[PDB]
Write a protein that binds this ligand. Sequence first.
Ligand SMILES: Cc1c(S(=O)(=O)Nc2ccc(-c3ccncc3)cc2S(C)(=O)=O)sc2ccc(F)cc12
Ligand SMILES: [Zn+2]
Length: 220
Amino acid sequence: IIGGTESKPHSRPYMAYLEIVTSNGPSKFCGGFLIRRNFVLTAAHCAGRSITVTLGAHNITEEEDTWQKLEVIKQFRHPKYNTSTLHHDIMLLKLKEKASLTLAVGTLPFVPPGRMCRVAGWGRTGVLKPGSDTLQEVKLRLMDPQACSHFRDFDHNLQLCVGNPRKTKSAFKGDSGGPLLCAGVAQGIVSYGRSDAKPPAVFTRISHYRPWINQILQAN
Ligand SMILES: Cc1c(S(=O)(=O)Nc2ccc(-c3ccncc3)cc2S(C)(=O)=O)sc2ccc(F)cc12
Ligand SMILES: [Zn+2]
C-alpha cells in the first residue's frame, strides 16, 4: 500500500496474510480475505505449491494471541484464469479447519458501487520499498473504465479501475488478493497495475464472479 495509513490493529478482521510456496522455488506473499470460516478469497496469481494463511494479524513479524494460522488444503483457481492477460484473477482457498470467529478474526460479507473505496495489505509502500510489517490501508477512488484504457487487456465487465492518477495512493506489489471495500462491502480484489506504481490499478470485479463463488462454497 502506497500513501496509506497503518491500520488500527485488528480493525479489518477479515484480512488474511498468505505465505505461498511457489510451485517451482521460493516463497511469496499475498493478501486475501476470509468469507467463510474455512474459505479465503484471493487472486489467482497467488497460487503455489502450498499456502499458509495467517488470520488475526497486524504486524506479521509479531505473533499474538489473536493469530490463527491455517494450512490451505485446496486451491480453487478460476478455471478460465489466464496467466498472461490476468482475466478471471480470482481464487478460493479452502482451509484445513474452520477459523474461530473472534473480535480479531471475522468473515467479510457481500448492487452497484460508489466512488470512495478502501484497500488494505502488507505490500510494498513505494516502488522500490520493502513490504509493510504492519497492515496498511488507503482510500482510493473507483474510476471510469476509460481511465484504464491503457491496459490493453482491461475489461469493464470483469474488472474495476481503481486509484486517481493525480495522487500516489495505490495498492501495490504484495497487496495482491486483498479486498477493495466500498461502503463496507467487498467489490474488488487487487490484481495488477503499473510496475512504476502510477494509478489507477486493476482489480477483479467480484460481482461478476458471484455464481462461481456460490458454486464452490455450496459444494465444499
Ligand atoms: C501486483 C502488481 C504489480 S506487479 O508488477 O507485481 N505484477 C504484475 C504487473 C502487471 C501485470 C499485467 C500487465 C499487463 N496485463 C496483465 C497483467 C501482471 C502482474 S502479475 C500480478 O501477473 O505478475 S504492479 C501493481 C500495481 C498496482 C497493484 F495494485 C498491483 C500491482
Ligand atoms: Zn494486536
